[PDB]
């Protein structure tokens, strides 16, 4: 009995950054060194825990969050960062413990003519607290006049889509991001490796 990391890391489709998906994992035996030695990921940063010593440690349950963001945008997925993504789409707490992983996905996510199935929020009335989602698509109100459901001056739609082209630069190249966060609470504390 082993934890199902492969199904998460080899999924056919990935959610949008504004509607990232969550999947808790428990009651299983995990293996992190097989993931570590893949030599195919681009970034592997673990704030607070050494990646080489993950196997010799035990927790209560872990969470897996995944989405797709622009290549130049990966730098905002970190504790204590400032940016439009951190403000409006996905914010990490200051005391975050876990790892962040991201690798290029050009040949799977870029096609001729562009893929418009990935969207990111543009405006929000207030900053996001850590770890919550916002699937609302109500018209934004920039001015001091009610929009009344019509889009125009000072009334903008909150969401637009990325445009991915094979000829785009590596900076605009799509990247797939998977974030693991380890929890610790009074419990049987089942999940941990061999």
């Amino acid at each position: 009995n082993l934890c199902p990391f492969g199904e998460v890391f080899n999924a056919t489709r990935f959610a949008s950054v504004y509607a990232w998906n969550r999947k808790r994992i428990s009651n299983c035996v995990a293996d992190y060194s097989v993931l570590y030695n893949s030599a195919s990921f681009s970034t592997f940063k673990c704030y607070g825990v050494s990646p080489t010593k993950l196997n010799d440690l035990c927790f209560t349950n872990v969470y897996a969050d995944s989405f797709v963001i622009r290549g130049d945008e990966v730098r905002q997925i970190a504790p204590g960062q400032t940016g439009k993504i951190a403000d409006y789409n996905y914010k990490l707490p200051d005391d975050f413990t876990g790892c962040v992983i991201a690798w290029n996905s050009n040949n799977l996510d870029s096609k001729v003519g562009g893929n418009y199935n990935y969207l990111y929020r543009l405006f929000r009335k207030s900053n996001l607290k850590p770890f919550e989602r916002d699937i609302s698509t109500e018209i934004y109100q920039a001015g001091s006049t009610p929009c009344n459901g019509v889009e125009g001056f000072n009334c903008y739609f909150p969401l637009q889509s990325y445009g991915f082209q094979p000829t785009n630069g590596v900076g605009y190249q799509p990247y797939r991001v998977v974030v693991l966060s380890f929890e610790l609470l009074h419990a049987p504390a089942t999940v941990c490796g061999p």
Epitope: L122, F123, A142, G143, S144, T145, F153, N154, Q160
Partner: antibody, heavy 121, light 109 residues
């Protein structure tokens, strides 16, 4: 405050590009519209563009010749016109409201200094 | 579309007399997206009234807008030497934001 580029003189059939740099306020939540006026004539509306998402709207006369773009890095708005003719000689303005944060002003109070463009041979 | 026509073309009034303008449209226009601009020869236009009833920042109180529907008016209580210019009315609710033909105010002697 809005600052534009200098005057330019062109040849018929070519294309021109005018930049309208913005500073001193949150440019992310604003929107720019372009108005031109001939010598001693009435103001003429061209179009407008929302800087947040790059969406733009155009009038029917200049639908196939006018292109509006933006640059978030330098907070600069670009306007270009191709296949210029003799009657296109005028001065061009860029206007946008003063945005401080989420809330923003309800009118195009901020205006540029204008750019003189002459088309001739 | 929407067409705007300022009925009084040119008005020559000595300082002191109140002056009026009339910006009338063809179709019903939203009352929250109308404005008036002032332009002097050789300078960029300056915003005076926005929202059909409220004035801009720093505009002296003599200017005052009124009216709704297909009729809109601008009223100057008592003219001043620096208020002789051309005034345009523009609306931006619909897709084409057509301007008006303008009205010129000059000294009478």
């Amino acid at each position: 405050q809005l600052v534009q580029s200098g005057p330019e003189v062109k040849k018929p059939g070519t294309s021109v590009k005018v930049s309208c740099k913005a500073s001193g306020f949150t440019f992310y939540y604003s929107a720019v519209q372009w108005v031109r006026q001939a010598r001693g004539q009435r103001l003429e509306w061209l179009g407008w563009m929302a800087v947040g998402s790059g969406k733009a709207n155009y009038a029917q006369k200049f639908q196939e010749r006018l292109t509006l773009t933006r640059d978030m890095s330098t907070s600069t708005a670009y306007m270009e016109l191709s296949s210029l003719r003799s009657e296109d000689t005028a001065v061009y303005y860029c206007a946008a409201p003063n945005c401080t944060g989420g809330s923003c002003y309800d009118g195009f109070n901020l205006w540029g200094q204008g750019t003189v463009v002459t088309v001739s041979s | 579309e929407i067409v705007l026509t300022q009925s009084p073309g040119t008005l020559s009034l000595s300082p002191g007399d109140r002056a009026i303008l009339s910006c009338r449209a063809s179709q019903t226009v939203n009352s929250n997206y109308l404005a008036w601009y002032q332009q002097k020869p050789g300078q960029a236009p300056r915003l005076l009234i926005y929202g059909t009833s409220s004035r801009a920042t720093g505009i002296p109180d003599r200017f005052s807008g009124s009216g709704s529907g297909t009729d809109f008016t601008l009223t100057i209580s008592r003219l001043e030497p620096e208020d002789f210019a051309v005034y345009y009315c523009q609306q931006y609710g619909s897709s084409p934001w057509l301007f008006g033909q303008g009205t010129k105010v000059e000294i009478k002697r």
